[PDB]
Symmetry: D2
Subunit: 226 residues, 4 copies
């Protein structure tokens, strides 16, 4: 049995990462969780589960979303395969403006449980067809550093690239396919990397000079381009 | 030791045989040298003269001359079925790579190409004062960072300009992304597409895409009713 | 909804490929079809040793259409080649249960009985279509249940009927291929391993030539470089538990 | 131009190797991840693209870092058949120090300062088959102290299991944890064949101490 969880409106990707990590203890993920940006960051994730575990998953989820409140937040649950009506809503939510009403109507029609405009994102995140995506690895700061100046040093290094083998060593990259994300302010993300190749993300990741402890990091698949 | 070969036939009103000839070269030279990658098919101007082919081989110093000779011979043989060759030895230098990128994004002159060719020591074999030198250099110098695969099936000569015997069959393909979706599900993008030439073009049929697994699914499913000479996989700067 | 089709008891891979191509017209395949060999010390011909399966996504409404088409297609193939009976067909609906997965693993590592196969088939509700009391049921169940965690690609090209049992018209001249790992190495350098190998059948076997490898790009390099003198009916890519 | 660097000695080898790869990456273009070559089913090597002008700069750099922190082997140009063959031979059998220096001189390798067998074999090894090995390194202040790592028992995402039930059994473990003890500067490590699966595993590891850095290697070893 498939079960999907969507959340929208600690930022969303932080909590969504907690959920993904916790639920992976009791259920088999289909894939990395997904970060769906409406132009917005809603998060969704899918697990293979048995009938008898729905309650446990539901309870866990609302348990964690609350502790990380114990310090608007739309949770959406769907059992089974994403039906065409929901996929169509997601594609629609990303092309144009959709109302909370349209969202309520679609959740009822597809039998989602909806536990703030958070429902629009929770729903769309669940239904988003990731035929096209990039990876986005996000590292998170320990709470002691939130609001503290970011301690991370970007050193200029060359990377390894098959396509450049025939070229001279000073060959220049026509495209930056992998990019660093450098947040600011109370945001709990320390640093992140976006790209389409996992090995290339690793190359970048290992080379980043990180002078403060990463609480944890999470790889997402996102409808965002590099 | 790297040797690169660029073929381009622009000041050849008509033509059509460029990728066909490039495929024969790739196939023949693989007999004696080690290819770096599939050959590359480069279009200079995406607004549709501007179609060139290149390829890169590893080889020992002793056999550079032999590669050049074989190439000249095959193009000669293949041409005399009723041209434009560039060679480059060693790594592709920054300037030739920069030239390639420039050619892909704006009009360049023959004088600019001669300049680059002399600076990087490319051999423009028996130049005939055409624009073909531009495509040959641009093809050699193109870095395959962004590209798509393009598989092209070639017709036997006896079939050229004959009615095409191919059946496009409407089937579903195996797509990982749609696993969590219901059977009846909108496919948002088509990332793999057919090329369907008409008339005397020697290409029977082609496929352009980003993933080789998906290219193979499509290719095996194509009903080919005529026997083909061969097919060749190219990487190209074009998109779907 | 998921439907799996298994085939057992030459024409097995041929028939399986046709099944895979035809059902793709109406249902969404999960992956390339799978070719499952039960014993490496034994020939992947018949009987019961070499089997084929495939998995499709289809809506509840069309499940019966799939089964019906599969049977018609196998019936016809029997009619044409007049052999003249069906190879065994097995259907399973829904996910493959742990019981069937484990049977498939046990069948690859040890001898199993027809009774053991009947036992799992009843337990997981596989439909063994028109059973003929053979060992084929084992191969069909095993093929359906096999988890493709470890596998190898196998591209098989098939001959037109007129050419069957006619001397093969295919030539493999040596060429070098493009290999990333060889970049830092001098030109004169031999592979320590061959990861991609040719399959060259003989006699009346409908397979023209095949290729087994772990990498699709390399399979494609070897495939485009093969000189094929006779026309081929079609070719099919399988994933298999076999290795090079 | 290609330059190759190989090190080996009679723990700190992959650590020093990682530092070299990281520093040289600042001035030269790596061909690939560094390679870890174990002669018994060890030695590190790496390959960078430079121009003639940078040879001394790289050599000088390497020599400086290894001493601040063992045989060093350098080579310029493509790896010749003779070195590759020695590399392959050094695995499947026993080779003498003398056999190694002979091979070194024949292929114009520079042997700075065993041990050389390992450096040479590392440089020359054809890794047509390899696994990825991700290694996380402790800060020196933590070496020889109790490890701050928690193994989290989780399910991972796998394509092949999509059509099986939830209670499906995983027939092979293709990705495995490396858990050293004692003074070893490696905090923890992961070996697998798929970088995607490596990342899944890496992100779930609960790391309770500040690590110096981590390095991905390619290695001849299997799981």
């Amino acid at each position: 049995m498939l079960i999907h969880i969507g959340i929208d409106d600690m930022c969303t990707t932080y909590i969504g990462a907690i959920l993904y990590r916790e639920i992976s203890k009791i259920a088999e993920p289909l894939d990395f969780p997904r970060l769906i940006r409406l132009n917005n960051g809603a998060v969704a994730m899918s697990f293979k589960i048995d009938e008898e575990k729905i309650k446990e998953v539901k309870t866990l989820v609302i348990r964690y979303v609350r502790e990380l409140a114990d310090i608007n937040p739309g949770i959406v649950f769907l059992i089974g395969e994403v039906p065409k009506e929901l996929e169509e809503f997601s594609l629609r939510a990303l092309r144009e403006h959709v109302t909370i009403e349209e969202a309520e109507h679609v959740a009822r029609k597809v039998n989602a449980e909806v536990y703030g405009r958070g429902i629009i994102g929770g729903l769309a995140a669940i239904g988003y067809p990731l035929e096209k995506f990039t990876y986005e690895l996000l590292a998170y700061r320990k709470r002691e550093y939130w609001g503290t100046p970011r301690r991370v040093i970007k050193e200029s290094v060359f990377y390894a690239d098959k396509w450049s083998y025939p070229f001279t060593y000073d060959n220049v990259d026509p495209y930056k396919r992998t990019v660093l994300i450098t947040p600011h302010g109370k945001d709990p993300v320390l640093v992140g990397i976006r790209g389409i190749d996992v090995g290339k993300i690793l190359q970048v990741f290992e080379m980043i000079k990180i002078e403060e402890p990463i609480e944890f990091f999470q790889v997402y698949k996102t409808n965002q381009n590099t």
